[PDB]
């Protein structure tokens with residue numbers, strides 16, 4: 001989500017009554033880092049290539 | 051430390067736009083001067099102005115308010131709302 | 136009298152503020168629990 | 184989250200250091216240096232490999248070799264004298 | 266998809282912001298930057314005479330993908346802004362009175 | 372003509388005490404999320420994913436630990452040691 005929209009929770013990017021997902025805590029702010037530049041499959045190829 | 055004022059923002063944006071070359075005149079610039087109509091800027095020149103505004107102040111802005119700052123007084127009243135300098 | 140003390144302590148002798156007003160448990164936890172619980176350490180050290 | 188990353192990276196090697204130390208106190212019986220270094224030339228290679236594999240994964244975690252290294256650069260959310 | 270209007274203007278101004286930003290973080294040596302920015306400017310000035318919707322949409326999503334190729338690993342963020350390193354160091358705590366839960370103490 | 376007696380005077384039940392003010396605003400989404408997660412077992416069903424996880428962690432993984440634990444039973448005797456000596460028993 002972008003940070004510039006003014007949520008209730010700027011810390012976690014979440015409006016006050018917003019429906020949480022099936023299996024939320026993989027999609028939390030406290031969830032893993034989840035990079036967005038490479039595709040994960042490509043990234044696997046480049047790491048094993050080096 | 052270093053704390054900005056309103057007149058500091060004023061003189062920085064006036065000396066900013068006096069450096070730019072596709073303005074109409076260096077004499078018709080006011081706090082209330084429209085960038086699009088009074089200064090004779092395009093749809094796309096005003097975006098490069100906004101880009102220089104945000105580079106020179108430090109602060110970065112989204113596109114949600116990048117069109118909001120149509121006149122110069124709106125740019126000054128924008129930038130004096132942010133505690134970053 | 137218990138309710139008239141503690142309700143007035145919550146909303147507002149009442150109108151003072153000094154610390155710390157001794158509670159109900161501190162007489163037999165500092166003077167029976169804690170010294171027997173220190174004596175237990177002493178006996179465990181010297182029984183070793 | 185960088186503190187999470189850093190300490191859980193170090194804890195990965197702390198597990199293998201505990202494994203290695205449980206091997207230490209059964210091969211040599213002792214945790215002191217003065218007995219282990221006196222008797223280390225008698226135990227054969229098939230055991231010291233098992234020891235120093237554990238005590239090298241322990242160092243590979245904290246002295247930041249390639250197997251896990253992404254807690255150093257993820258420790259710059261602390262300040263500069265840290 | 267549509268000619269001269271606000272819905273096309275907001276799009277192309279957003280894409281022009283992104284096309285200057287995604288070369289700001291990309292090189293050092295400001296001389297080369299302001300050169301490159303003038304020719305990026307010339308690319309937007311040269312093709313802005315399209316009179317049909319279809320070839321407009323064709324060049325439009327083609328340059329959306331061209332801008333999508335040259336993405337950068339970390340964009341230059343000012344530190345007090347939410348990609349940066351000064352972001353939320355000491356947020357001042359909100360002024361709040363103590364909400365009490367126990368009748369008895371405290 | 373069968374009524375419990377006129378000699379009862381039964382009243383209402385209080386739990387007694389102090390109305391503590393609300394220190395928490397409950398979020399309806401988080402509340403129904405958590406009520407869905409704790410009582411998850413009343414709506415669980417067998418699918419291919421559920422069966423795959425149940426095949427691994429209940430059957431295959433105890434059997435693998437069983438093979439490793441009952442085969443390698445009294446092999447290793449790492450008490451003293453020397454060079455060239457037997458490290459195992461079998």
Ligand SMILES: CCCCCCCCCCCCCCCCCC(=O)OC[C@H](COP(=O)(O)OCCN)OC(=O)CCCCCCCCCCCCCCCCC
Pocket residue numbers: 030031032033184185187188191192195240250251257
């Ligand atoms: C062959 C030589 C062996 C030498 C080593 C080889 C490489 C091994 C590398 C993997 C081991 C690393 C240690 C595992 C712990 C990882 C902890 C961790 O990374 O947590 C970080 C994560 C948040 O970090 P992040 O979001 O990325 O921070 C960004 C800051 N800007 O914080 C989190 O929220 C993560 C919470 C989940 C933590 C991971 C849970 C899975 C752990 C896997 C352990 C596997 C155990 C399986 C046991 C099976 C035994 C039969």
